Structure 1
């Protein structure tokens, strides 16, 4: 048993809710919150900009030090950093950005990072400003992640479409 509340169960291990991931993280304080990161960990907009804003820019300060030491992530890759006031840890995962012409095939590799964590609160990778089809992202999530994932979908109309179209 865990404290995630109000989720619809899609499969044995995937759950979904219409929620703001920032507000969800603040309430639950999960062990792991996933950020929709880019390779530079520049948290300007989308989920990343919102998570970073909620940390009062501490996520960005930590991220800039990480990049200065280690260089950029790979598309499809991840790193574990602090969750600040939102979670114990933040798993920064880079899904492909279609608006940069990145290979959508890399979305499966991106979701594989979730399997290193038993339970996660996460957004749909490559959705939103990353330009992929969220229905496709949900399918890849369900077919790739084997650990317990709680998906927060900000947009109510999209949440309803994702549920109603789920196979």
Structure 2
């Protein structure tokens, strides 16, 4: 049994809710929240900008030190950093950004990072300002992630379309 409440069950392991991932993280304090990161861990906008704002920029300060030591992530890659006030850990995952022309096949590699964690609160990778079709992102999630994933979707319109169209 876990703390997550109000989710619709899509599969054995994937759950979805119309929610504010920031507000959901603040309530649950999950072991892992996933960030929709870029390779530079520059948390300017989208989910990353919202998560970072909720940490009062501490996520960005930590991320800048990580990049100064390790250099950029790979598209499809990830790193584990602090969850600050939101979670124990933040798994920063880089999905392909279609608005940069990145290979959408890298979306499966991105989701494979989730399998290193038993339970996660996450957004749909490559959705929103990363330009991918969120319906496609949810299909790749269900077909790739084997651990227990709680997906948060703020836009009620998109949430309803994802549920109604789910095979």
Regarding TM over 0.5, the answer is yes
Match for residue 47 of structure 1? 47
Distance in 1 of aligned mates of 2:115 and 2:153: 20
SS in 2 for 1:16: strand
In the TM superposition, residue 20 of structure 1 has moved relative to its aligned partner by: 0.3
Matched, 1:96 2:109: no
Deviation sequence 1:55-84 (CA, Å, 0-9, x none): 000000000000000000000000000000
In the TM superposition, residue 51 of structure 1 has moved relative to its aligned partner by: 0.0
Matched, 1:59 2:54: no
Q: CA RMSD in A?
A: 0.1
SS in 1 for 2:76: coil
Residue correspondence of structure 1 range 7-86 to structure 2 within 5 A: 7-86=7-86
SS in 2 for 1:85: coil
Distance in 2 of aligned mates of 1:49 and 1:73: 18
Distance in 2 of aligned mates of 1:62 and 1:154: 26
In the TM superposition, residue 27 of structure 1 has moved relative to its aligned partner by: 0.1
Distance in 2 of aligned mates of 1:135 and 1:53: 27
In the TM superposition, residue 146 of structure 1 has moved relative to its aligned partner by: 0.0
Distance in 2 of aligned mates of 1:158 and 1:19: 11
Structure 1: segments with no counterpart, 5+ residues:
none
Distance in 1 of aligned mates of 2:116 and 2:3: 20
Query: Displaced runs of 4+ in structure 1, greater than 6 A?
Result: none
In the TM superposition, residue 124 of structure 1 has moved relative to its aligned partner by: 0.0
Distance in 2 of aligned mates of 1:88 and 1:138: 25
SS in 2 for 1:74: coil
**Count of aligned residue pairs for this structure pair:** 167
In the TM superposition, residue 25 of structure 1 has moved relative to its aligned partner by: 0.0
Structure 2: segments with no counterpart, 5+ residues:
none
